[PDB]
Ligand binder design. Sequence first.
Ligand SMILES: Cc1cc2nc3c(=O)[nH]c(=O)nc-3n(C[C@H](O)[C@H](O)[C@H](O)COP(=O)(O)O)c2cc1C
Length: 377
Amino acid sequence: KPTLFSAYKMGKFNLSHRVVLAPMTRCRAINAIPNEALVEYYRQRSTAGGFLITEGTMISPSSAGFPHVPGIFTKEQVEGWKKVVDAAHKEGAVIFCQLWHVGRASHQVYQPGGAAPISSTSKPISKKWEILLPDATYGTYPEPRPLAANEILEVVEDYRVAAINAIEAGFDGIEIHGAHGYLLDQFMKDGINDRTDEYGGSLENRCKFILQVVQAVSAAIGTDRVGIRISPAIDHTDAMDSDPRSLGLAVIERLNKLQFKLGSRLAYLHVTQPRYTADGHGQTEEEEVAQLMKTWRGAYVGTFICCGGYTRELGLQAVAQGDADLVAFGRYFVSNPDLVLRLKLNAPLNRYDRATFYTHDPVVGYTDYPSLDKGSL
Ligand SMILES: Cc1cc2nc3c(=O)[nH]c(=O)nc-3n(C[C@H](O)[C@H](O)[C@H](O)COP(=O)(O)O)c2cc1C
């Protein structure tokens, strides 16, 4: 029976264990160019047969909603990524690039020519939420501009190009970021999408954009090199759906149908879940969310990655009970470069410092968290 530390065939790829580096924005790619800091960060976290998912990576200039996040839409960016990917591969890692467009979760200071961010809607994120600005202050999310149909197709093309560029950089595949209230989620969630055209209304219409993206990148680089991340039950930055269960199942039904039509499976479905503890890890002393995650996994035909507040014990149980094939860890991987070894040994985990999640130093709070002492053989 599978355990968290068992080998796994993720279609094309052989993994040696089920512990995954969750995608995490860290803002060390100064002026959007992957650099020596990113090389060392991913190298430190690489293991033989371990799966890595990168930080969200811009597909276009309008994709930006954080400072110093990498892109993969220029040759210069691709050349920077090659060095990261080569180092991870030297350690035996498998690595996917997460393709990211923030949509309305942006600010004029991040947009070319100071243009309004783009979205499904003209409705801004409410003032309940604020955005980190490049000068280390927090600002107000502005009114976005609703995309026309032809402009949505332009963004689909941006995803296609980014996927091709990822393969040129040597990535094993890409992950479509369709979670956390960003552009594709702004179309999926009925709390945001108030369109009256073919991209609004029904679940079919609301899932249209993300399915067009999946279809385009699958054609470009192959189904087996494409993963997809969603979060139907996370309502971060005013991104709520009235029926998360049905939304998740609607995406899944369409992924299943596409796989059947094309004749092959996607690399995986990746779902991130909310937690209800004070620190956002583990479970309290909702079963609703747990049931939802198992329902979605049961419905999806293929590899399922779970993420969000997983602990060593909950990760062990998720794989042992068949709730997930792979378990991704975010915050613990920030502070534990050798997280896989620590989980295998049930060693203590380094505390993580939220204050340097999104700062820009190549060392401080980024690559200077220690591994366990390996000694000298
Ligand atoms: C600093 C930080 C940056 C993150 N950046 C991304 C991102 O770029 N793309 C994404 O899909 N999720 C991102 N996440 C969400 C994580 O992938 C993960 O789902 C979340 O941290 C919950 O998992 P955890 O409990 O193991 O930390 C980020 C989380 C943090 C804390």
